[PDB]
Amino acid sequence: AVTIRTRKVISNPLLARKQFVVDVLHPNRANVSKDELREKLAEVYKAEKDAVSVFGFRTQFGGGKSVGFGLVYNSVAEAKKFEPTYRLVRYGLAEKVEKASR
Amino acid sequence: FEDRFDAREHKDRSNKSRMQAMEEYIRESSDQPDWSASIGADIVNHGRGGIKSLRDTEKERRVTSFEEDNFTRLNITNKAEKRKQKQRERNARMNVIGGEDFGIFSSKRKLEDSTSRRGAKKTRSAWDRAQRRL
Amino acid sequence: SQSTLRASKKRLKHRFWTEVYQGAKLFYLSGVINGRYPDREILNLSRFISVMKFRPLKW
Amino acid sequence: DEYNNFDAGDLDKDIIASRLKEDVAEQQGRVFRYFGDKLLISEAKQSFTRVGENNLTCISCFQPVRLFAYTVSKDLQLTKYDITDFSKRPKKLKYAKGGAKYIPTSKHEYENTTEGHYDEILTVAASPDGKYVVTGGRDRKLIVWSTESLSPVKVIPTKDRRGEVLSLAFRKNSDQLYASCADFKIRTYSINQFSQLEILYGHHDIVEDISALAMERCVTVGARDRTAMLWKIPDETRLTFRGGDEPQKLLRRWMKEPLFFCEGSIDVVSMVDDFHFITGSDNGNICLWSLAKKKPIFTERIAHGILPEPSFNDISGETDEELRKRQLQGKKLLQPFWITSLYAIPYSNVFISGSWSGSLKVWKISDNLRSFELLGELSGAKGVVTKIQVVESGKHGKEKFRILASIAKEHRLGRWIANVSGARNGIYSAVIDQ
Amino acid sequence: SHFLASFDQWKEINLSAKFTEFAAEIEHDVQTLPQILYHDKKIFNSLVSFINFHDEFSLQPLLDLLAQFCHDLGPDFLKFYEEAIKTLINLLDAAIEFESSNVFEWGFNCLAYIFKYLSKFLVKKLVLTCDLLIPLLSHSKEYLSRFSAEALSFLVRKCPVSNLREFVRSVFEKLE
Amino acid sequence: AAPHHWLLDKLSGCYAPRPSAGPHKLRESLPLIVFLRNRLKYALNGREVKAILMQRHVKVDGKVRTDTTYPAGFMDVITLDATNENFRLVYDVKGRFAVHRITDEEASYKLGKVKKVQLGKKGVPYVVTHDGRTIRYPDPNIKVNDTVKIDLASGKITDFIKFDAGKLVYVTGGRNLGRIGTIVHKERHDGGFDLVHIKDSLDNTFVTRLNNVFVIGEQGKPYISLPKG
RNA sequence: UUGCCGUUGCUAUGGC
RNA sequence: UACAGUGAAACUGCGAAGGCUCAUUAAAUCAGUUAUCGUUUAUUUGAUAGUUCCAUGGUAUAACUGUGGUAAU
RNA sequence: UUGAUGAAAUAACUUUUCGAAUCGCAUGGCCUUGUGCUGGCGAUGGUUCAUUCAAAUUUCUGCCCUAUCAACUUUCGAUGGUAGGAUAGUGGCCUACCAUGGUUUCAACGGGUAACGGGGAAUAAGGGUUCGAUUCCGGAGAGGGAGCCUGAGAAACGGCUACCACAUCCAAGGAAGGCAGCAGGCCAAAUUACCCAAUCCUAAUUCAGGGAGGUAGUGACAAUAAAUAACGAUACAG
């Protein structure tokens, strides 16, 4: 099954955050399944599921592992305040559309 | 005359005298082990590459450690990659057989005239050579 | 699949060049937007028509 | 060194290295329990409980931060023991026998999810939280049993035709198991999650022995490649430590003015801290190895002595004693008791070595970590020692240990072992003190 | 339990001078909920001292820890519920003079947390809370009367019609 | 294009930030974007470094001063509130920008090399430093290249460390950006190759320029701390 | 103290 | 029932703040560097304003309306 | 024998600037019997000085051959003083008068290419030993010279006045921008679509932007590693 491993956990309280690198080990699976992985990270730490994000997923040749960048928050308010809009329209709840002209 | 700041006068160049022959001898006679990988994970495009060179795996270690040290994926900057990546894979597939490069034996670069035969401590007096021997 | 679009592009272009003189212009017009073809595509298609150097035949 | 000796980059990296977390599992702590000469030797309570199983194979033990051990036999039987009574024999809690009932009905590789063994359970490992034990052998399976029921709660195959597991090690204080499969493979499993993390390749003969400690590193050794590797499992890299004792040059070292010879096979490991380990070899060598040297720091040439010479009544079948004594060629065919079970108390000054020499040998490494010395001998275990480990009790200044070791009459992998000089099959328990 | 785990995760997340002060004073009062609930009065005196400090960078952790102490006791803050009201109003008015969105967020959050942990077991709530909210009732404020009235709504809808009737009869004589 | 002092690795991007107007120079300053972003890494990029500068955690020179290209140069006492990150920044031995951690005691002060003492208007004594600390009414013996001590709560010169014989020196200039030890010689010329020369572990002797130099303290007692290794 | 068989302890050993 | 939300046209604040072709300049181009008490300097940053005899100051003009000219801005 | 203040106050010009008509947090104090006195606090104001950045002048330092280039410089003053002008100011930078200066064989002045190449201008790339990364070729111009204006910065890429031509409208009276411009080609004439996410710049900004930057699509020069099958059985024939 899908197993997770955090490494190099640092605390950035200036952005009120804790950021780390994620080894995602999936044997005979398709790939990471980012949402289910975020639920697993929400479970392995304190919950904050709409405050946790992972973005830097790179699989390796032949499968097996993937390396990404995880960053858990406290306080979904500052998750909205600091996590940028493109990641928020990917995962969270902000959405911005533009008047495309010219 | 007068003093001018110069990063090229106290900069770590350190590549004008690194030769793979000398480093290969130092690695042979070091008596400290050398952190080889698991034996499958080093070949690249299911074999369509090489295995990969030693310069390649140290550069790759630097890229992934810089990656895990300041959180940034690189790019497809086209002028840079259209020179260096295609030239890198072309010299790799011409010279690197079995993961070991052999271009160092088919390229003119004088080993003694940059790597051995020290220059500052050249011992240009017989008193100096006797003292430095003893 | 823009891959299979490029593949059919190359196949139809070479097979067209075999039947006409080699160097014959194949002009790809995509799907229709609003009843007719895209105006940039029609612009440079008409630009190709705007110079063709018609040579006199016999009959 | 001057008055100004700072580097901006290095003080930056120490700023980040202060800022990070996990000063928890990465303890590169050397030997700190320097108790090699402090404890006694010649008054250990040597209780050998002979148990009714042909050819026991391995022992897993347990301490928390009640106490149970486990045994596993060539008669397909695990048996759990209570060892929490520190001055008597262990007691039987549950037997568990596999056999012909668990041969799969398919003869195909992925559906080897039968709930028992059928051939030669080879090693066993009890969890650091004690919830589970895991055991495996030549049925290319790892079976995880519960503690309180001894049910197989999961069966994970190694999934190839030569997937014999030969040694197991949980890393300390974690739920991650490293099993050294005979496919020149190391498989890693997460036992509370029941998953496989990493497979990792790289040995040259069958990976006969494994050992782990508090960090994610591991040390493995293969049989006849005569190299010992250690693995960074996050980085998936390894250091290779070859042997390298030449009998001709050791003869020259004695010939400066002597039956010591070459090396067949490295057998056993035990990692003593996160900067050294010790390997037991086929010519009775015990070698102590750093993390910064290929060749070993210290070699003890013969550790358990030399096998007895073959008898003149059983060498040829000629009539006269002169020719039957001629057919021994002198000292040319004397071979040593190969060290076949080695154990280190973690971060300690002592370690234990055992074979069919009849006496276990306790040794202590020197304080400078460049040599080691025989402390004493333990003459209460007649037979091959298939596993050694130690159980502790008591606080830092005063502590009492019981060496739990398993004794059989045949080696744990192939038989090969004749001249059973009155050996018995059971658990040797030596309580040493202070 | 989980009080020491939440406190240590908050300590591993955010830390400042007042967090250093609280951790140095009570490094042995994080786990063992029986012992911390025994010596909670010294924790309440240190909480009043850190509220007098009124630190901007170590506020949310200590305020949520005091709310977790009031929740983990749930009956034992009866004596220093008065000092809880006085210190929380003093720090909230200090942050009101500070005028920040995180300041108002933490103030309203701890008000709602103390109301959620204190609105269950109280049926003599209206007179006992109006005894300290008589100063909080009328202070020429656009927002503080709304904050008092919402908490009085939570204290009125969470008791009986006989209880709210006794409350209206008792607070009918302090009315006109 | 990017300067050597900031330890900008070549793996940065394309464009390097030109630091704006402020107290310090162009060549003798690293802005707060390259400070927080890729030197000690409290922010990852421009978006969140502007987010933390709009969250306003920083107290460089005891004030907030919210801008990315604010040229916080030599020994501007950086102070960040969340877990009391107190940093006085110096040069290392190769010209870069070291950041020595201090505490609140050392963060309650800093120094400044004087650059001129003039009699401008209304007879008021006058002293300006590298960070423009126009501070009022010293002793009249504020000499050339002397050093004043800044209170960092007020501006007042609380202590006065003289440029003269037998004081621990600093050098910002020459081929020698940032060495310490100052005792082989005082060779004072009248405008060129004029300096107090500096030692080494083998006590060598070096040549620098006069306004490219100031005094940090005394040989054997600087109270302005220096890192080690 | 077990697959048995024996010396047994009123607990140790030795033969498969 | 003196202003109240969308709101077609104007001013304002700001924006475009840096790119083609042709003849061939030898420390005069360019770089490093000293100085500018010989000097211009918006912006950033630090300081820095004491002369009153016998309840708050006038129209000119946009937008807005209205009449018109011109093929026409 | 050492130690110290220490070798802008006055008499006037001038079409002379201002001593708050900015906003916020705070009911708060004292009985002058009512906004009677309000009064604690912060940013922007605002003169001058300094600082940053930038601009222009200034001494010095930096690979061609150079004498069939040996004399140069007073033939846009040549070299210097004194004074005026104007400059941001010093300044023969222009003007009067005065001196006959000033350089060079220790190489003045004067003549080149591989000055599409060079000057460390600079990234270096762990073997390519001058190929190999980047700043600028020189200075202009917005049809051509001429004259004005704007602005912290301009002799404005995008402002005005007259002349000289190339040009479009046209009701033949009468208004302009400029496109005499640039991208293409002499059997590949389609790049000209998507974002400010990373970098950097401005910003009134817990917003907006930026064809600077970044991303995609065609445009073959047969330059590079695979496949188009592998493993059996049986029968028949010589």
Q: Do F193 and B10 touch (CB under 8 A)?
A: no
Closest CA to F174 of D39, A7, D86, B1: B1
Could you give the CA distance from residue D78 to residue D89 in angstroms, rounded to a whole number?
A: 18
Neighbours of F213 (CB within 10 A): 22
- Residue E166 CB burial class (10 angstroms; 0-12, 13-18, ≥19): middle
Q: Do A13 and F82 touch (CB under 8 A)?
A: yes
Residues F131, F214 contacting (CB under 8 angstroms):
no
Q: Which residues 6+ apart lie within 8 Å of D303 measured at CB?
A: D280, D284, D285, D286, D339, D353, D361
**CA of B1, C1' of I66: distance in angstroms:** 29
Of A9, A64, A65, the CB nearest to D21: A9
User: Chain F residues within 8 A (CB-CB) of chain D?
Assistant: 7, 39-41, 92-93, 96-101, 178-181, 200-201, 226-229
Q: After which residues does chain E become discontinuous at a C–N distance over 2.5 Å?
A: none
| Residue boundaries of the structural domains of chain A | 3-102
User: In which residue are the tokens 């994620």 written?
Assistant: A22
CATH of A3-102 given 3.40.50.1970, 3.10.20.30, 3.30.70.3370, 3.40.190.10: 3.30.70.3370
Q: Do A3 and D193 touch (CB under 8 A)?
A: yes
Could you give the CA distance from residue D43 to residue D433 in angstroms, rounded to a whole number?
A: 8
**CA of F17, C1' of I160: distance in angstroms:** 40
Residue E170 in contact with partner chain A when CB distance is under 8 A = no
Closest CA to D334 of D300, D307, D301, D303: D307
Closest CA to D376 of D31, D40, D35, D38: D40
Q: Please compute Rg for chain E using Cα positions.
A: 17
Asked if strand H comes closer than 7 Å to F166 Cβ, the answer is no
Q: Give SS3 for D403.
A: strand
State which amino acid sits at residue F185.
H
Q: How far is F79 from chain E (nearest CA, A)?
A: 12
> Which value in Å is the resolution of this experimental model?
3.4
A-chain residues within 8 Å CB-CB of E12?
11, 18
Long-range contacts of D177-183, Cβ-Cβ distance < 8 Å, separation of 24 or more? D177/D125, D177/D134, D177/D142, D178/D210, D178/D212, D178/D218, D178/D233, D179/D123, D179/D136, D179/D142, D179/D210, D180/D207, D180/D208, D180/D209, D180/D210, D180/D220, D181/D207, D182/D206, D182/D207, D183/D158
Give me F216's structure tokens.
């940090």
Give phi and psi for E112, each to the nearest 5.
-70, -35
Residue F103 in contact with partner chain E when CB distance is under 8 A = no
Q: How far is E21 from chain F (nearest CA, A)?
A: 12
Residues B87, B4 contacting (CB under 8 angstroms):
no
What string of DSSP letters covers D48-103? EEE-S-SSEEEEE-------EEEEEETTSEEEEEE--STTS--EEEEEEE--GGGS
Give phi and psi for D166, each to the nearest 5.
-130, -20
Asked if strand I comes closer than 7 Å to F18 Cβ, the answer is yes
Residues D70, D143 contacting (CB under 8 angstroms):
no
DSSP state of B70: H
User: In which residue are the tokens 């240990």 written?
Assistant: D401
A63: nearest CA in chain D? D198
Q: Looking at the C1' of nucleotide I134, which residue has the nearest alpha carbon?
A: F1
Residue D75 to residues A37, D61, E61, Cα–Cα distance (Å)? 44, 20, 60
Give me D24's structure tokens.
């928890």
Q: Which nucleotides of strand H come closer than 7 angstroms to any CB of the protein?
A: 32-35, 37, 42-48
**CA of D341, C1' of I96: distance in angstroms:** 116
Which helix or strand (DSSP H or E) is residue D402 part of?
A: strand D400-408
Specify which residues D46 forms β-bridges with: D430
F-chain residues within 8 Å CB-CB of B4?
174-175
Helix then strand count (H, E) for chain D reads 3, 28
Judged by 3 or more CB pairs under 8 A, whether A touches D is yes
Residues D51, D95 contacting (CB under 8 angstroms):
no
Q: Do B71 and A69 touch (CB under 8 A)?
A: yes
Could you give the CA distance from residue A18 to residue A27 in angstroms, rounded to a whole number?
A: 28
Asked if strand I comes closer than 7 Å to F166 Cβ, the answer is no
Could you give the CA distance from residue D325 to residue D333 in angstroms, rounded to a whole number?
A: 13
- The CA-based angle F177-F178-F183, given to 5 degrees, is 115
Dmax (CA) of chain D: 87
Could you give the CA distance from residue F196 to residue D388 in angstroms, rounded to a whole number?
A: 70
Which helix or strand (DSSP H or E) is residue E9 part of?
A: helix E3-13
If DSSP states are collapsed to H, E and C, what string results for A62-91? Answer: CCEEEEEEEEEECCHHHHHHHCCHHHHHHC
Closest CA to D361 of D348, D380, D334: D380
Of A10, A11, A25, the CB nearest to D197: A25
Chains that touch D (3 or more CB pairs under 8 A): A, B, F
**CA of F76, C1' of I17: distance in angstroms:** 39
Which ranges constitute the DSSP H helices of D276-402? 321-326
Residue E13 in contact with partner chain A when CB distance is under 8 A = yes
Could you give the CA distance from residue D179 to residue D211 in angstroms, rounded to a whole number?
A: 9
Specify which residues F86 forms β-bridges with: F79
Q: Which protein residues have any CB–strand G distance under 7 A?
A: D 47-53, 89, 92, 380, 420, 422, 424
DSSP state of A48: -
Give me D160's structure tokens.
């190839």
Q: Give SS3 for B55.
A: helix
F-chain residues within 8 Å CB-CB of A82?
48, 51
Q: Which residues 6+ apart lie within 8 Å of D339 measured at CB?
A: D267, D268, D280, D281, D284, D285, D286, D303, D304, D353, D354, D355
Asked if strand I comes closer than 7 Å to F229 Cβ, the answer is no
Q: Which nucleotides of strand G come closer than 7 angstroms to any CB of the protein?
A: 1-4, 12-16
Could you give the CA distance from residue D325 to residue B66 in angstroms, rounded to a whole number?
A: 71
Q: How far is A80 from chain E (nearest CA, A)?
A: 14
Residues C23, C17 contacting (CB under 8 angstroms):
yes
Q: Count of alpha carbons within 13 Å of A89, Cβ hemisphere only?
A: 5
Q: How far is E74 from chain A (nearest CA, A)?
A: 24
Asked if strand H comes closer than 7 Å to B5 Cβ, the answer is yes
**Domains located in chain F, CATH noted:** 1-105 (3.10.290.10), 110-160 (2.40.50.740), 163-229 (2.30.30.30)
Asked if strand H comes closer than 7 Å to F45 Cβ, the answer is no
Q: How far is D62 from chain A (nearest CA, A)?
A: 26
Specify the length of chain C in residues: 59
Which helix or strand (DSSP H or E) is residue D133 part of?
A: strand D132-137
Could you give the CA distance from residue D361 to residue D342 in angstroms, rounded to a whole number?
A: 10
- Nearest nt (C1') from D52 Cα: G2
Q: For testing the chain A interface, which of B48, B61, B71 should be mutated: the one with the most A CBs within 10 Å?
A: B71
Q: Which residues 6+ apart lie within 8 Å of E160 measured at CB?
A: E123
D-chain residues within 8 Å CB-CB of B32?
292-294
Could you give the CA distance from residue D6 to residue B68 in angstroms, rounded to a whole number?
A: 25
B2: nearest CA in chain F? F193
Chain B residues 77-116 with Cβ under 7 Å of strand I are 77-79, 83, 91, 93, 103-105, 107-111
Give me E51's structure tokens.
């509220």
Q: Give SS3 for D309.
A: coil
Q: How far is F181 from chain D (nearest CA, A)?
A: 7
Q: Do B70 and F193 touch (CB under 8 A)?
A: no
